[PDB]
Design a protein around this ligand. Structure first.
Ligand SMILES: [Ca+2]
Ligand SMILES: [Ca+2]
Ligand SMILES: [Ca+2]
Ligand SMILES: [Ca+2]
Ligand SMILES: [Zn+2]
Length: 316
């Protein structure tokens, strides 16, 4: 809508207070005009009809419990935009400042979030397995990163290319969490998963096997569930990313860590320059090795750690 840019305040899902960019025109709307062609957050109103209604508020304060998921979807979309802009010089997911749109209160008791080809969508969870999913910065950045992937490499959501697609979303979700310094870790979804139970998460990058995901290629899932294991086999790549950044010894192979910034630059380059829609794990290794060579030279430590890390997870 057309109006005056202003700043509202509200409380997110975890009860923290934050300022959000709004637009005023009779009502205050969750429309942030400060970022690209805008960030827009919608109320799906417990239905499945998308996007629903652009979020309107009478007084520019967002402290109702019903408001909380909209506050975080709006705020964390902004943070994720800032990460791609400031760190990788990328303007929104398409590179040309496309409007970022999210809907919250999707369906009833819905324990997931997704990118639907055009926008992000967040369920409220059922209160036991999940609380509203936009509460996790790593979840929000995970979903938006699918948009970045679709516009760059175009990784198919199937089999190994699909597991690469998922891993890229976990990797950048985690790097965004670190960038925002929101109690960061190498776990996925810990902030919104099983509110009754502390210390768990949906997936682990530092140790995938903790929740039964493979941490080595010899352990890959080869069946048909989960589109050929796109959320399961991503563990193999997630462990590799973790090793490249943090270092460690895994199945007897030692890896010297090169840090998160370099992990990010290497994988952003592989994604936007060398990956293709049908890329498999072996090609991801080649892409990532070629990216580190481009950036740091063929005899650098950075190329060596990338090779070490893929060796460690059995990807040749
Ligand atoms: Ca209000
Ligand atoms: Ca965290
Ligand atoms: Ca996390
Ligand atoms: Ca939990
Ligand atoms: Zn995903």
């Amino acid at each position: 809508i057309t109006g005056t840019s202003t700043v509202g305040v509200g409380r997110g899902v975890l009860g923290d207070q934050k300022n959000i960019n709004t637009t005023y025109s009779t009502y205050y709307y969750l429309q942030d005009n400060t970022r690209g062609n805008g960030i827009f957050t919608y109320d799906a109103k417990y239905r499945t009809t998308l996007p629903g209604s652009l979020w309107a508020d009478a007084d520019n304060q967002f402290f109702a419990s019903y408001d909380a998921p909209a506050v975080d979807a709006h705020y964390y979309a902004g943070v994720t935009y800032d990460y791609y802009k400031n760190v990788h010089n990328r303007l929104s997911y398409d590179g040309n400042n496309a409007a970022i749109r999210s809907s919250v209160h999707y369906s009833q008791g819905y324990n997931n979030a997704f990118w639907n080809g055009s926008q992000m969508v967040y369920g409220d969870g059922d209160g036991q397995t999940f609380i509203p999913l936009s509460g996790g910065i790593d979840v929000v950045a995970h979903e938006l990163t699918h948009a970045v992937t679709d516009y760059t490499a175009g990784l198919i959501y199937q089999n190994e290319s699909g597991a690469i697609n998922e891993a890229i979303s976990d990797i950048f979700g985690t790097l965004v969490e670190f960038y925002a310094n929101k109690n960061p870790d190498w776990e996925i979804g810990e902030d919104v998963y099983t509110p009754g139970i502390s210390g768990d998460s949906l997936r682990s990058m530092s140790d995938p096997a903790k929740y039964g995901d493979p941490d080595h290629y010899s352990k890959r899932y080869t069946g048909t569930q989960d589109n050929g294991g796109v959320h399961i086999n991503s563990g193999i790549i997630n462990k590799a990313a973790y090793l490249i950044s943090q270092g460690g010894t895994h199945y007897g192979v030692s890896v010297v860590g090169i840090g998160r910034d370099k992990l990010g630059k290497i994988f952003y380059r592989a994604l936007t320059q060398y990956l293709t829609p049908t890329s498999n794990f072996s090609q991801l290794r080649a892409a990532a090795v070629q990216s580190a060579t481009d950036l740091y030279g063929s005899t650098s430590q950075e190329v060596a750690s990338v090779k070490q890390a893929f060796d460690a997870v059995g990807v040749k």
